[PDB]
Amino acid sequence: PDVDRFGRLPWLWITVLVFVLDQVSKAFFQAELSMYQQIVVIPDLFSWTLAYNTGAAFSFLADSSGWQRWLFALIAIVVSASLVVWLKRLKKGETWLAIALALVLGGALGNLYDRMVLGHVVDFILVHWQNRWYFPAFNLADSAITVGAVMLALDMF
């Protein structure tokens, strides 16, 4: 039948789905919000926002600005290749690792698309607790990446 002649490749549709979901997520809050404007949902815990993270967390490694767009894009490019062959190698019934690889792959490709098209990464989820602290904004791609890491970290038990 068709299901076996493609192998573990039909799992890529979950990767394709996450990429699409994340791209429409960014396209909405971009053309809907202003930069750093926040739409309060839970007054002291959650809001929508429009922060553009240029990857300025690792700015301590150099006295330049702009190379994160490339160093991180290359990371996603190479990491995606090793996570494509990894899914090909898997077997039927390893549906835990097939979802986990598809989740991590889909998110990283959605953020690789950002850095290749627009220098920054769109983020729109400000989880906070009053003025006490504010977690950095993220997107559907980060959500897919983080879940897949958990699924892989709970596969070594």
Partner: peptide
């Protein structure tokens, strides 16, 4: 991979 992630935003940061």
């Amino acid at each position: 991979l992630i935003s940061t």
